[PDB]
C-alpha cells in the first residue's frame, strides 16, 4: 500500500456486525425515547412498560427503595415511580359517569335539563348536587311535594316557564 496506487488498491477498512438471537435474555438495547411528564390532566402513560390512563397527582405513600409499583385491592395500579427521576406519582382515573335527561313532557314544553350523575361541574344555569351536576334548572329555596326525583333529596318540576330544582 502506497499512495500512487489507484482506487481499486486503496486499503478499505471494513467492519461486520453479526447479531445472534438464539435463547436471548437480551442484554443490549439502547433506544432513548423519553418525553417530559405531564400532571393533573387525563394522559396516556407508559412507565417502563406499564401502560394505562388516568390523572397524575403528587404521591403521599412511602415506597420502599426496591419497589417500583403500587396496587390496591383487585390489582388496580394506584401509583408508579418514574424511571428517570424516581419520584412517586398517584394514578386516579379521571371522572366519568352516566347522563340523564330531565323532561317535563313533550306535550307541556320542549325545554329540557340534563343531569350528569358522577361528576363535579368543574370538569363537565349550572348547579351542584350530591347526585351530580345539574344543568338547565334553577335552584329555588321553596320546598314542594316533588314529582321528578333526581336524587339525594332533590327533585325538579315545571315552574309555570322554567324547570326548578
Amino acid at each position: 500500500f502506497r499512495p500512487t496506487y489507484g482506487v481499486g488498491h486503496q486499503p478499505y477498512r471494513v467492519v461486520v456486525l453479526s447479531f445472534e438471537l438464539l435463547h436471548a435474555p437480551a442484554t443490549v438495547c439502547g433506544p432513548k425515547k423519553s418525553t417530559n411528564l405531564v400532571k393533573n390532566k387525563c394522559v396516556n402513560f407508559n412507565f417502563n412498560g406499564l401502560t394505562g390512563t388516568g390523572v397524575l397527582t403528587e404521591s403521599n405513600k412511602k415506597f420502599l427503595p426496591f419497589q417500583q409499583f403500587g396496587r390496591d385491592i383487585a390489582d388496580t395500579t394506584d401509583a408508579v415511580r418514574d424511571p428517570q427521576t424516581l419520584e412517586i406519582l398517584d394514578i386516579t382515573p379521571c371522572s366519568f359517569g352516566g347522563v340523564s335527561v330531565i323532561t317535563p313532557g313533550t306535550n307541556t314544553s320542549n325545554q329540557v335539563a340534563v343531569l350528569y350523575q358522577g361528576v363535579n361541574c368543574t370538569e363537565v344555569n349550572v348547579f351542584q348536587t350530591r347526585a351530580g351536576c345539574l344543568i338547565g334548572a334553577e335552584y329555588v329555596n321553596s320546598s314542594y311535594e316533588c314529582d321528578i326525583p333526581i336524587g339525594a333529596g332533590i327533585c325538579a318540576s315545571y315552574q309555570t316557564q322554567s324547570i326548578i330544582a
Binding site: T27, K61, F63, Q68, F69, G70
Partner: protein, 235 residues
C-alpha cells in the same frame, strides 16, 4: 446434623407495594418448621450439594470465613460453569467454564483451568450478625435475596429483600461453597487435614412450591406469614 427451621426464609416476591392488606401467593418458599442440614466451618474439601429448586443459605460467623459460592452442572470446563466470589472490596460474578480441581481453592486467589467467559459483573460487596441468603434460578434469571440481622436460628420474623436479579441463563444443576483462611496454602488436591479457621457454621435448606398468606403493614413491609398447608388451623 438437623434442626427445625422456624418462621424464616420469607421474602418479598414481587417488589410491588401493598398497604394494610393480606395477600396469598403461590411460589417456591421454605416450609415452616422444616428441618435443615447443619454444618461446621472448621475443616473439610467441601462435599457437593444439589441445586434442586432453590437453596436457603444462612450463616452465623464473625471472621469472614465464608467468601463465595460456585454453581453449575459440572466442575469441568466442558460447560460454561458459574462463579460467584465476594470480597472486602467488591463482588466478582463470572460465567466462564473454568475447569476446577477436586476441591474449591481456599483463598492463592484462584485455582481453575482456562476460561471462555461470556458474562462478568462487579459491584459493592454483599456485606453475632445472622446473614441470610436465598438463591433462585427459574425463569432464565438467577436471583439473590438477602438480609443481615442482629441476634441457633432466632424465633423472630423477618423477610428477605431482593438484592440482585441477574440475566445469565446458565443451566445450573449442582452447587458448592467457597471457604477462606488467612495465610493458608492452596493446592489442587488436599487431604482431610485442612487448615485452622474461626468457629463458624452454615445452614442449608431446600425451597418447595407452597402457598403463603403474607401480611403487609401500613408501610409495605411483611410482618407475618401463614403456611397454607402446615396444619388444619393454618389451612
Amino acid at each position: 446434623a438437623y434442626t427445625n427451621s422456624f418462621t424464616r426464609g420469607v421474602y418479598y416476591p414481587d417488589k410491588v407495594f401493598r398497604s394494610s392488606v393480606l395477600h396469598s401467593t403461590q411460589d417456591l418458599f421454605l416450609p415452616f418448621f422444616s428441618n435443615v442440614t447443619w454444618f461446621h466451618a472448621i475443616h473439610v474439601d467441601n462435599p457437593v450439594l444439589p441445586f434442586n429448586d432453590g437453596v436457603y443459605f444462612a450463616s452465623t460467623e464473625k471472621s469472614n470465613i465464608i467468601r463465595g459460592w460456585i454453581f453449575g452442572t459440572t466442575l469441568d470446563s466442558k460447560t460454561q460453569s458459574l462463579l460467584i466470589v465476594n470480597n472486602a472490596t467488591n463482588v466478582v460474578i463470572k460465567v466462564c467454564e473454568f475447569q476446577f480441581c477436586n476441591d474449591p481453592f481456599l483463598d492463592f486467589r484462584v485455582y481453575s483451568s482456562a476460561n471462555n467467559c461470556t458474562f462478568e459483573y462487579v459491584s459493592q460487596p454483599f456485606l453475632k450478625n445472622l446473614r441470610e441468603f436465598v438463591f433462585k434460578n427459574i425463569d432464565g434469571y438467577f436471583k439473590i435475596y438477602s438480609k443481615h440481622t442482629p441476634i441457633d436460628l432466632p424465633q423472630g420474623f423477618s423477610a428477605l429483600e431482593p438484592l440482585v436479579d441477574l440475566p445469565i441463563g446458565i443451566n445450573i444443576t449442582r452447587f458448592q461453597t467457597l471457604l477462606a483462611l488467612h495465610r493458608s496454602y492452596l493446592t489442587p488436591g488436599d487431604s482431610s487435614s485442612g487448615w485452622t479457621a474461626g468457629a463458624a457454621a452454615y445452614y442449608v435448606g431446600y425451597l418447595q412450591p407452597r402457598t403463603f398468606l403474607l401480611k403487609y403493614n401500613e408501610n409495605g413491609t411483611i410482618t407475618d406469614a401463614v403456611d397454607c398447608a402446615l396444619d388444619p388451623l393454618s389451612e
